[PDB]
């Protein structure tokens, strides 16, 4: 329903292999979004067409402020098209690129906002995202958007055990990404980092990290009690938005 000639284009927001992000604008309303402009030369090079159909049915049916909403998507003889929500501050990545790390209440605010949009995802029927920080955006006012749209070494950091030895996977998975997360965030580097990726499969798969001097007790407890091996010994959403250190950090309410 939606066409080309409904958009004034702008500059380029990222560019990939997969495509692109224009800032761009709603000829009619002037609203000013993204637009994700896909070649299907790529959606076909790779096996991700089905996989990407599938995720603009679900994120389409999804609603919350800290998701990256998507508004609605068309197509043509050689490309696809996203209209996504614009997030002007950029990516969680790039923000941790520029401080080295974040302060307590930073950090428990994104982690907040994180749990708040996947315990609506939980309900929403969608047990995973990937919220690796590149998938981070960041709205007007800083606000956290998860936006696990698009894909394009650290690809096993962000993992949890039952994945990396090719188990099965549960809710649970995301409150693993929470503690990885939630210790980069303070750190600055993830707690599985290092030069090979068997020896960061080691230390996943046997839960071995340790936290630099500066790192308070409560920020160790809450990560302690997310990395846990066992998926089911994971706390839920509710623990972790009620947890001490949250509401003792956190400024953006549950
Ligand atoms: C899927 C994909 C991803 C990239 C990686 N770049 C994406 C664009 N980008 C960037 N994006 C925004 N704002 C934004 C992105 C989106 C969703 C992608 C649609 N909605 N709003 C802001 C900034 C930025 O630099 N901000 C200020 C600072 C610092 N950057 C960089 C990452 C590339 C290509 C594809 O296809
Ligand atoms: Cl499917
Ligand atoms: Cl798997
Ligand atoms: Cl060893």
């Not at 950029?90 to 080295?100: A, C, D, H, I, N």
């Not at 906002?113 to 990937?130: F, G, M, P, T």
């Not at 965030?185 to 340790?210: D, H």
């Not at 959403?237 to 003792?248: G, N």
Request: a neutral charge; hydrophobic letters at 35%; glycine letters at 6%.
């Amino acid at each position: 329903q939606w066409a080309l000639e409904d958009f004034e284009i702008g500059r380029p927001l990222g560019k990939g292999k997969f495509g692109n992000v224009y800032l761009a604008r709603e000829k009619q309303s002037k609203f000013i979004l993204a637009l994700k402009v896909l070649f299907k030369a790529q959606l076909e090079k790779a096996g991700v067409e089905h996989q990407l159909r599938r995720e603009v049915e679900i994120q389409s049916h999804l609603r919350h402020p800290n998701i990256l909403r998507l508004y609605g998507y068309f197509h043509d003889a050689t490309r696809v098209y996203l209209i996504l929500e614009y997030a002007p501050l950029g990516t969680v990545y790039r923000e941790l690129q520029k401080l080295s790390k974040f302060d307590e209440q930073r950090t428990a605010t994104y982690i907040t906002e994180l749990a708040n949009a996947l315990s609506y995802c939980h309900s929403k029927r969608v047990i995973h995202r990937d919220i690796k920080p590149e998938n981070l955006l960041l709205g007007s006012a800083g606000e956290l958007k998860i936006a696990d749209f698009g894909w394009s070494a650290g690809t096993l950091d962000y993992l949890p055990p039952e994945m990396i030895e090719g188990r099965m996977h549960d809710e649970k998975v995301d409150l693993w990404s929470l503690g990885v997360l939630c210790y980069e965030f303070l750190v600055g580097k993830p707690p599985f980092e290092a030069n090979t990726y068997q020896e960061t499969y080691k230390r996943i798969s046997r839960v071995e990290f340790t936290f630099p001097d500066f790192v308070t007790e409560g920020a160790r407890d809450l990560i302690s009690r997310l990395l846990k091996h066992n998926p089911s010994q994971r706390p839920m959403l509710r623990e972790v938005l009620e947890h001490p250190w949250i509401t003792a950090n956190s400024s953006k309410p549950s």
